[PDB]
Design an enzyme around this catalytic site. Structure first.
Site, PDB file in Angstrom:
ATOM      1  N   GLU A 115     -42.751   8.555  -5.885  1.00 18.65           N
ATOM      2  CA  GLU A 115     -42.524   7.220  -5.338  1.00 18.65           C
ATOM      3  C   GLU A 115     -41.959   6.278  -6.391  1.00 18.65           C
ATOM      4  O   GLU A 115     -41.102   5.437  -6.086  1.00 18.65           O
ATOM      5  CB  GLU A 115     -43.822   6.660  -4.760  1.00 18.65           C
TER       6      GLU A 115
ATOM      7  N   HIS B  52     -39.653  17.010  13.546  1.00 14.08           N
ATOM      8  CA  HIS B  52     -38.276  16.569  13.358  1.00 14.08           C
ATOM      9  C   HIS B  52     -37.371  17.043  14.487  1.00 14.08           C
ATOM     10  O   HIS B  52     -36.416  16.347  14.845  1.00 14.08           O
ATOM     11  CB  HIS B  52     -37.757  17.047  12.004  1.00 14.08           C
TER      12      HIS B  52
HETATM   13  C1  LIG Z   1     -27.189   3.798  10.700  1.00  8.45           C
HETATM   14  O1  LIG Z   1     -28.054   4.344  11.699  1.00  8.45           O
HETATM   15  C2  LIG Z   1     -28.809   5.478  11.252  1.00  8.45           C
HETATM   16  C3  LIG Z   1     -29.580   5.984  12.448  1.00  8.45           C
HETATM   17  O2  LIG Z   1     -29.340   5.185  13.598  1.00  8.45           O
HETATM   18  C4  LIG Z   1     -29.708   5.082  10.084  1.00  8.45           C
HETATM   19  O3  LIG Z   1     -30.351   6.251   9.588  1.00  8.45           O
HETATM   20  C5  LIG Z   1     -31.769   6.043   9.444  1.00  8.45           C
HETATM   21  O4  LIG Z   1     -32.127   5.698   8.095  1.00  8.45           O
HETATM   22  C6  LIG Z   1     -33.534   5.504   7.887  1.00  8.45           C
HETATM   23  C7  LIG Z   1     -33.709   5.066   6.452  1.00  8.45           C
HETATM   24  O5  LIG Z   1     -32.486   4.599   5.897  1.00  8.45           O
HETATM   25  C8  LIG Z   1     -34.284   6.792   8.214  1.00  8.45           C
HETATM   26  O6  LIG Z   1     -35.683   6.594   8.036  1.00  8.45           O
HETATM   27  C9  LIG Z   1     -36.234   7.746   7.359  1.00  8.45           C
HETATM   28  O7  LIG Z   1     -37.177   8.416   8.195  1.00  8.45           O
HETATM   29  C10 LIG Z   1     -37.727   9.606   7.611  1.00  8.45           C
HETATM   30  C11 LIG Z   1     -38.583  10.297   8.655  1.00  8.45           C
HETATM   31  O8  LIG Z   1     -39.951  10.126   8.298  1.00  8.45           O
HETATM   32  C12 LIG Z   1     -40.755  10.233   9.493  1.00  8.45           C
HETATM   33  O9  LIG Z   1     -42.095  10.577   9.169  1.00  8.45           O
HETATM   34  C13 LIG Z   1     -42.825   9.597   8.403  1.00  8.45           C
HETATM   35  C14 LIG Z   1     -44.198  10.171   8.113  1.00  8.45           C
HETATM   36  O10 LIG Z   1     -44.080  11.086   7.030  1.00  8.45           O
HETATM   37  C15 LIG Z   1     -42.882   8.292   9.204  1.00  8.45           C
HETATM   38  O11 LIG Z   1     -43.588   7.314   8.459  1.00  8.45           O
HETATM   39  C16 LIG Z   1     -41.457   7.807   9.486  1.00  8.45           C
HETATM   40  O12 LIG Z   1     -41.490   6.576  10.197  1.00  8.45           O
HETATM   41  C17 LIG Z   1     -40.667   8.872  10.237  1.00  8.45           C
HETATM   42  O13 LIG Z   1     -41.266   8.952  11.530  1.00  8.45           O
HETATM   43  C18 LIG Z   1     -38.529   9.202   6.371  1.00  8.45           C
HETATM   44  O14 LIG Z   1     -39.062  10.367   5.761  1.00  8.45           O
HETATM   45  C19 LIG Z   1     -37.627   8.457   5.375  1.00  8.45           C
HETATM   46  O15 LIG Z   1     -38.392   8.048   4.249  1.00  8.45           O
HETATM   47  C20 LIG Z   1     -37.817   8.659   3.074  1.00  8.45           C
HETATM   48  O16 LIG Z   1     -37.564   7.669   2.095  1.00  8.45           O
HETATM   49  C21 LIG Z   1     -38.732   7.042   1.562  1.00  8.45           C
HETATM   50  C22 LIG Z   1     -38.265   5.903   0.691  1.00  8.45           C
HETATM   51  O17 LIG Z   1     -37.426   5.064   1.483  1.00  8.45           O
HETATM   52  C23 LIG Z   1     -39.518   8.103   0.801  1.00  8.45           C
HETATM   53  O18 LIG Z   1     -40.629   7.501   0.158  1.00  8.45           O
HETATM   54  C24 LIG Z   1     -39.990   9.162   1.798  1.00  8.45           C
HETATM   55  O19 LIG Z   1     -40.751  10.163   1.129  1.00  8.45           O
HETATM   56  C25 LIG Z   1     -38.805   9.766   2.561  1.00  8.45           C
HETATM   57  O20 LIG Z   1     -38.161  10.643   1.641  1.00  8.45           O
HETATM   58  C26 LIG Z   1     -36.897   7.280   6.038  1.00  8.45           C
HETATM   59  O21 LIG Z   1     -37.864   6.274   6.285  1.00  8.45           O
HETATM   60  C27 LIG Z   1     -33.980   7.210   9.646  1.00  8.45           C
HETATM   61  O22 LIG Z   1     -34.602   8.455   9.943  1.00  8.45           O
HETATM   62  C28 LIG Z   1     -32.474   7.339   9.849  1.00  8.45           C
HETATM   63  N1  LIG Z   1     -32.172   7.689  11.228  1.00  8.45           N
HETATM   64  C29 LIG Z   1     -32.061   8.953  11.652  1.00  8.45           C
HETATM   65  C30 LIG Z   1     -31.746   9.132  13.106  1.00  8.45           C
HETATM   66  O23 LIG Z   1     -32.211   9.907  10.896  1.00  8.45           O
HETATM   67  C31 LIG Z   1     -28.885   4.446   8.970  1.00  8.45           C
HETATM   68  O24 LIG Z   1     -29.748   3.944   7.957  1.00  8.45           O
HETATM   69  C32 LIG Z   1     -28.021   3.309   9.514  1.00  8.45           C
HETATM   70  N2  LIG Z   1     -27.173   2.769   8.463  1.00  8.45           N
HETATM   71  C33 LIG Z   1     -27.442   1.633   7.808  1.00  8.45           C
HETATM   72  C34 LIG Z   1     -28.691   0.912   8.219  1.00  8.45           C
HETATM   73  O25 LIG Z   1     -26.707   1.207   6.924  1.00  8.45           O
END
Ligand SMILES: *[C@@H]1O[C@H](CO)[C@@H](O[C@@H]2O[C@H](CO)[C@@H](O[C@@H]3O[C@H](CO[C@H]4O[C@H](CO)[C@@H](O)[C@H](O)[C@@H]4O)[C@@H](O)[C@H](O[C@H]4O[C@H](CO)[C@@H](O)[C@H](O)[C@@H]4O)[C@@H]3O)[C@H](O)[C@H]2NC(C)=O)[C@H](O)[C@H]1NC(C)=O
Ligand SMILES: *[C@@H]1O[C@H](CO)[C@@H](O[C@@H]2O[C@H](CO)[C@@H](O[C@@H]3O[C@H](CO)[C@@H](O)[C@H](O)[C@@H]3O)[C@H](O)[C@H]2NC(C)=O)[C@H](O)[C@H]1NC(C)=O
Ligand SMILES: *[C@@H]1O[C@H](CO)[C@@H](O[C@@H]2O[C@H](CO)[C@@H](O)[C@H](O)[C@H]2NC(C)=O)[C@H](O)[C@H]1NC(C)=O
Ligand SMILES: *[C@@H]1O[C@H](CO)[C@@H](O[C@@H]2O[C@H](CO)[C@@H](O)[C@H](O)[C@H]2NC(C)=O)[C@H](O)[C@H]1NC(C)=O
Ligand SMILES: *[C@@H]1O[C@H](CO)[C@@H](O)[C@H](O)[C@H]1NC(C)=O
Ligand SMILES: *[C@@H]1O[C@H](CO)[C@@H](O)[C@H](O)[C@H]1NC(C)=O
Lengths: 596, 194
Positions: free
Chosen positions: A357, A487
């Site tokens: 982290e 997923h």
């Molecule tokens: C354009 O649109 C797209 C989609 O419409 C956007 O893509 C999304 O981006 C976000 C972040 O930028 C993604 O969010 C990620 O979700 C991952 C899934 O985790 C699931 O499980 C955990 C529990 O373990 C839940 O808490 C969570 O809510 C989910 O249900 C997370 O794992 C990701 O976290 C990662 O990063 C953090 C630090 O930020 C690390 O600490 C974590 O360990 C992990 O590695 C992240 O939160 C989201 O999934 C994307 N969408 C899709 C469909 O994939 C684009 O961002 C957007 N463009 C922009 C905004 O410019």
């Protein structure tokens, strides 16, 4: 006075309104995740609807500038991102039906629980129960029953939902002036309109194929050794020249082999490595844990935190009054702020997660002077990999000796090194083939080569063909085996894990070469080196402007991925397993089945 | 002798004005004040590129100018001889060879609202560059398209935005405090000494 100037002014207003609303959403999400109240969920929904409506409004507005006469290559990227996110395309009824299906699948599957057979008194949920079932409990019959309960009756009545969802998503992909939904996924890896390091959507598949072909023998030898070790435990379900059953991989979902570390490690006489007992005796707490974690990044030269994050970012569980579901994640609050949420217990794994982290937040702070739709990694897997590498290169015995917790009486024995390499390589080599198999099948289904009545049959056929693990009990087409994954239920992108796993060893090899370390690759440290930090900082502050190919070439002197650093890292365990391979079997055949 | 004039109202004045129209204050023909200049309110910057202020009270200049406003905490470097970018070249231009003292300090606790301080406007869209020491209070809808304004819409934008503030923010983006000292002189007494 030009179209590009008008677009730049539009982006100027966008890069303020979006900042404000994203900060609103981040505050709402942080408050909800640190404090669970119904009104908190209410403001969460309000912020989400506001963000969606705003993005829809600007996607509608984007029609003023046609997407054909822009040349700055940065305004073009920003406008392409605007067109990609926030544009409603399909009809309202179809979109509502699709969203309803998505909402009714994932939450219901997550909340689904199985009760004690012939006993409705106990009904364990997903979080407890199966976690200990796929553990030291060796009851084959109980594990098979749990697998059947978690697969059959859910895949039945989940199959039609996904069968309609795939067709609806194909309609959406066709409506978005695109090719198949596999093309839509591959679009994120595609960047064009540049000279030299250009990419496209027709190279990633070939790269994956080449990497798998290069990596096959190592996985072959490793899983052959695993099968030879496991033959003793249950010599009543696995043929010597057959295939492994599904429910004996240490996890119902697979994807990881850390569980099977217990009854597989050789040389059990040599003690393992752990400092948990000494930590409490030396009076270590969460604050000192995080300070020690940050000290490494301080020493390498990267900037450290301020009077913000430390005062904020609760690290201790406040009992049960303010209980919250705590999965350690790095929070991007926005507008010059960064936070970490994580329940802290004094353990080696928690320390490793704290390192992960801290690396995540350090990277996110590293890239901050960019417009709104530019602050991210070049690829999906970079964001996780840039923290995974730092987490990996801190448990090395040299790093422990530098820390000082480990007593000098610990012996640098080749057996201990072999055991550590085996422990790491278990997970590292396990995670890849299953991920590739799942991605191949999902792309094949989305494109279209087999009908629904043969979908699950072809699933199990190619699973046995490549993975070499056969289901203990034959499954009909009414079930949906791939649907078990969270997923898969959330249809999140899955190639990210493979990409980050491939990239992390490139990064580690390049950084260790820069640090000019002598010896085996695993015994490499960057505690006092600064050239590695400068080389990494040359990219960490870039953003999405420079393409991933250009950034990777500027960092490691290579324009794409290559498994050679991983092979060099795993060479010692490869030699040991080759030496051990004298009374085993090479390859596997799918002729044998568990059901005779 | 037995009298002087302080800067008591330069600070401790509560309400300030945004960078929309930077106010101007001036004093003349009475004893100056430099003893208590740096004995409170720890300043983030003290760069006096014009003349070193160690013996500022030794020499004097008639009709000194005092200005104060709140803009940001990170773009203080924009206020400098010969630098552009948003504020520096569109709201408060600085003369190339001007001599004076630029003092900026942080008062995040005082000038932040826990519910959202959203009442400090600023301009980022002006027709042309600005002249040294020039102000403006004009309020006209900005246009960058062939069609006229006739309201807001495509290529029709308001020339003003807002400094939303929240106390939970980090360092750098919080509302700091900026005070600018200046002076001029023609054939006259210097009028402010000690
Ligand atoms: C354009 O649109 C797209 C989609 O419409 C956007 O893509 C999304 O981006 C976000 C972040 O930028 C993604 O969010 C990620 O979700 C991952 C899934 O985790 C699931 O499980 C955990 C529990 O373990 C839940 O808490 C969570 O809510 C989910 O249900 C997370 O794992 C990701 O976290 C990662 O990063 C953090 C630090 O930020 C690390 O600490 C974590 O360990 C992990 O590695 C992240 O939160 C989201 O999934 C994307 N969408 C899709 C469909 O994939 C684009 O961002 C957007 N463009 C922009 C905004 O410019
Ligand atoms: C494509 O668009 C980008 C985005 O604007 C252009 O980059 C811009 O280049 C100018 C020229 O140097 C930069 O101006 C400079 O800004 C610095 C402050 O960073 C200032 O001190 C200098 O005096 C100068 O004014 C501008 O900042 C920069 N913009 C960004 C966002 O980085 C680029 O030039 C365009 N390319 C083409 C071929 O049109
Ligand atoms: C967790 O959230 C609850 C409600 O969402 C907070 O309770 C409110 O706190 C404010 C703060 O002064 C009070 O004015 C309200 O009267 C409280 N409402 C209720 C129903 O208790 C609670 O404070 C939050 N937790 C923390 C640690 O701030
Ligand atoms: C990087 O430098 C730090 C300090 O500059 C080293 O930390 C010292 O490690 C030795 C190991 O024997 C300890 O005896 C010292 O007490 C440590 N320093 C302090 C201040 O406590 C660190 O070992 C260096 N990195 C490597 C890989 O050697
Ligand atoms: C790292 O933290 C120390 C506090 O011990 C601070 O003095 C230093 O400025 C920080 N590093 C940077 C680059 O600011
Ligand atoms: C204003 O002056 C009074 C004393 O006259 C002092 O107590 C107070 O702290 C001052 N306020 C500020 C903002 O400096």
């Amino acid at each position: 006075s030009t179209i590009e100037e008008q677009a730049k002014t539009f982006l100027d207003k966008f890069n303020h309104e979006a900042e404000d609303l994203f900060y609103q959403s981040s505050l709402a999400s942080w408050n909800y995740n640190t404090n669970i109240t119904e009104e908190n969920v209410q403001n969460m929904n309000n912020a989400g609807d506001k963000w969606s409506a705003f993005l829809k409004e600007q996607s509608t507005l984007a029609q003023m500038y046609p997407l054909q006469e822009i040349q700055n290559l940065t305004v073009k990227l920003q406008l392409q991102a605007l067109q990609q996110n926030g544009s409603s395309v399909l009809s309202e009824d179809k979109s509502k039906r699709l969203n309803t299906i998505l909402n009714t699948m994932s939450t219901i599957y997550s909340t689904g629980k199985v009760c004690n057979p012939d006993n409705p008194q106990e009904c364990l949920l997903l979080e407890p129960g199966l976690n200990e079932i796929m553990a030291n409990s060796l009851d084959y019959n109980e594990r098979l029953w749990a697998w059947e309960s978690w697969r059959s009756e859910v895949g039945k009545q989940l199959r039609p939902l996904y069968e309609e969802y795939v067709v609806l998503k194909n309609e959406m992909a066709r409506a978005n002036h695109y090719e198949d939904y596999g093309d839509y996924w591959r679009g994120d890896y595609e960047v064009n309109g540049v000279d030299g390091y250009d990419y496209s959507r027709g190279q990633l598949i070939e790269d994956v194929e080449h990497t798998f072909e290069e990596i096959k023998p190592l996985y072959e030898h490793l899983h052959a050794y695993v099968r030879a070790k496991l033959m003793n435990a249950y010599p009543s379900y696995i043929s010597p020249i057959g295939c492994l059953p599904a429910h004996l991989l240490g996890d119902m979902w697979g994807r990881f082999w850390t569980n099977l570390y217990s009854l597989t490690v050789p040389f059990g006489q040599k003690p393992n490595i752990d400092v948990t007992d000494a930590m409490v005796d030396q009076a270590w707490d969460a604050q000192r844990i995080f300070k020690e974690a940050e000290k490494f990044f301080v020493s390498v030269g990267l900037p450290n935190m301020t009077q913000g994050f430390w005062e904020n970012s609760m690290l201790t569980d406040p009992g049960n009054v303010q209980k919250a579901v705590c999965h350690p994640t790095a929070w991007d609050l926005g507008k010059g702020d960064f936070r970490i949420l994580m329940c802290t217990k004094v353990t080696m794994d928690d320390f490793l997660t704290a390192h992960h982290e801290m690396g995540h937040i350090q990277y996110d702070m590293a890239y901050a002077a960019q417009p709104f739709l530019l602050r991210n990694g070049a690829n999906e897997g970079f964001h996780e990999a840039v923290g995974e590498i730092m987490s990996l290169s801190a448990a090395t015995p040299k790093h422990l000796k530098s820390i000082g917790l480990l007593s000098p009486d610990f012996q640098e024995d080749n057996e201990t090194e072999i055991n550590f390499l085996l422990k790491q390589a278990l997970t590292i080599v396990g995670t890849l083939p299953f991920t590739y198999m799942l991605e191949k099948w999902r792309w094949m289904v989305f494109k279209g080569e087999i009908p629904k009545d043969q979908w699950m049959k072809k699933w199990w056929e190619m699973k046995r063909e490549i993975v070499g693990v056969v289901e203990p009990v034959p499954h009909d087409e009414t079930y949906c085996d791939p649907a078990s994954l969270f997923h898969v239920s959330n249809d999140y992108s899955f190639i990210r894990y493979y990409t980050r796993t491939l990239y992390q060893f490139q990064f580690q090899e390049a950084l260790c070469q820069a640090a000019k370390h002598e010896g085996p690759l695993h015994k490499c440290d960057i505690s006092n080196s600064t050239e590695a930090g400068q080389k990494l900082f040359n990219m960490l502050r870039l953003g999405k402007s420079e393409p991933w190919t250009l950034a990777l070439e500027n960092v490691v002197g290579a324009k794409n991925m290559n498994v050679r650093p991983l092979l060099n890292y795993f060479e010692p365990l490869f030699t040991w397993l080759k030496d051990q391979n004298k009374n085993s079997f090479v390859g596997w055949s799918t002729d044998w089945s568990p059901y005779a | 002798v037995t009298n002087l004039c302080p800067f008591h109202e330069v600070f401790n004045a509560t309400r300030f004005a945004s960078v929309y129209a930077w106010n101007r204050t001036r004093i003349s023909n009475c004893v100056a004040d430099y003893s208590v200049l740096y004995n409170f309110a720890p300043f983030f910057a003290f760069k006096c590129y014009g003349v070193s202020p160690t013996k500022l009270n030794d020499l004097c200049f008639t009709n000194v100018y005092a200005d104060s406003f709140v803009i940001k905490g990170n773009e203080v470097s924009q206020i400098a001889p010969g630098q552009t970018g948003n504020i520096a070249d569109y709201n408060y231009k600085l003369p190339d060879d001007f001599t004076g003292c630029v003092i900026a300090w942080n008062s995040n606790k005082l000038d932040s609202k826990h519910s959202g301080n959203y009442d400090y406007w600023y301009r980022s869209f002006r027709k042309s560059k600005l002249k040294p020491f020039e102000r403006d209070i004009s309020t006209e809808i900005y246009q960058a398209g062939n069609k006229p304004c006739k309201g807001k819409g495509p290529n029709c934008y308001f020339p003003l935005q807002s400094y939303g503030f929240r106390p939970t923010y980090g360092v750098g983006h919080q509302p700091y405090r900026v005070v600018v000292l200046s002076f001029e002189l023609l054939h006259a007494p210097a009028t402010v000494c000690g």
